[PDB]
Design a protein around this ligand. Structure first.
Ligand SMILES: NC(=O)c1ccc[n+]([C@@H]2O[C@H](COP(=O)([O-])OP(=O)(O)OC[C@H]3O[C@@H](n4cnc5c(N)ncnc54)[C@H](O)[C@@H]3O)[C@@H](O)[C@H]2O)c1
Ligand SMILES: [Mn+2]
Ligand SMILES: [Mn+2]
Ligand SMILES: [Mn+2]
Length: 266
């Protein structure tokens, strides 16, 4: 245990995170001398933390969760192309020399789960509800994967316009829109908003729109609790394939580990 090499996950609060048991469970099952530990870091210590990471010689990497995805993107030494475009990371690899490299794999995680549900993005049409950190990562991953069309929804005009711009000038051969009157023509409908969370879970879409939901569509949600949101419950009742927040989170563990150099792509 004195010689165990480490990864970590940093955020605040941290007690709710599931990466540690998930990574450790895996570490144990394949007899790895590795462990993931949780770090609930106070925001005042961000700069100290980045510098501690550089000097932390037996640490391989560090997952980043709320609310430090943007803050740490700005404090690492290097960014992947997507991370740079998104302005946020959820994973850091520490090089042997101490350089911090960051990436954002929320998008890849989402695609991974989608693939298992038989969804191939090339040439399709998606609706992304929520233009936040996770929503932009998802839209951006869809675009890179060759989706034909992305339609966006967010009460925040500023954030919707920022994702319009990200996509518009990242992918000239991609049609973007913020206007639609039904769900009939989406191959994928993805909730990337907080709407759906918790024991009083609500729906991000009006009943009128939901009534237009078609069976052949994949309906996906990023929310982790409940696993089955009112959105997914209705989609399932209509016969759509559904993808859950836990599925997306789990499909990532595979990418986080590889970026940290601790787990294979799997
Ligand atoms: N499953 C996973 O792996 C996973 C990973 C990351 C985040 N999440 C979850 O994703 C959700 C969002 O995370 P975030 O980090 O992106 O937060 P965020 O705040 O950055 O972004 C959320 C966006 O939702 C928008 N929004 C709110 N109400 C909306 C509505 N009715 N319709 C459309 N858009 C609306 C907000 O304006 C905001 O832009 C949270 O529930 C988070 O817990 C899940
Ligand atoms: Mn091993
Ligand atoms: Mn919408
Ligand atoms: Mn647009």
């Amino acid at each position: 245990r004195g010689s165990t090499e480490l990864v970590a996950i940093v955020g605040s609060p941290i007690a709710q995170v599931k990466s540690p048991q998930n990574f450790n469970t895996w570490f144990n099952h394949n007899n790895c001398n590795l462990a993931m530990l949780p770090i609930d870091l106070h925001e005042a210590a961000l700069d100290s933390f980045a510098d501690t990471l550089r000097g932390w010689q037996n640490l391989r990497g560090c997952v980043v969760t709320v609310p430090y995805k943007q803050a740490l993107a700005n404090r690492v030494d290097g960014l992947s192309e997507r991370a740079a475009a998104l302005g946020s990371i959820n994973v850091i690899r520490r090089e042997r020399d101490g350089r911090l490299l960051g990436d954002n794999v929320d998008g890849a995680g989402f695609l991974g789960a989608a693939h298992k549900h038989g969804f191939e993005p090339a040439g399709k049409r998606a609706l992304v509800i929520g233009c936040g950190g996770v929503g932009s990562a998802i839209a951006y991953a869809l675009a890179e994967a060759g989706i034909a069309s992305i339609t966006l929804c967010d009460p925040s005009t500023a954030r919707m316009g920022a994702v319009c711009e990200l996509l518009g000038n990242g992918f000239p051969g991609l049609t973007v829109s913020t206007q639609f009157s039904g769900l009939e023509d989406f191959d994928l409908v993805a909730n990337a908003s907080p709407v759906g969370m918790g024991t009083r879970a609500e729906l991000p879409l009006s009943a009128a729109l939901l009534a237009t939901l078609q069976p052949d569509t994949l309906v996906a949600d990023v929310v982790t609790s409940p696993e089955i949101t009112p959105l997914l419950n209705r989609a399932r009742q209509v016969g759509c394939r559904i993808q859950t927040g836990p599925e997306m989170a789990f499909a990532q563990l595979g990418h986080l580990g590889a970026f940290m150099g601790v787990t294979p792509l799997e």
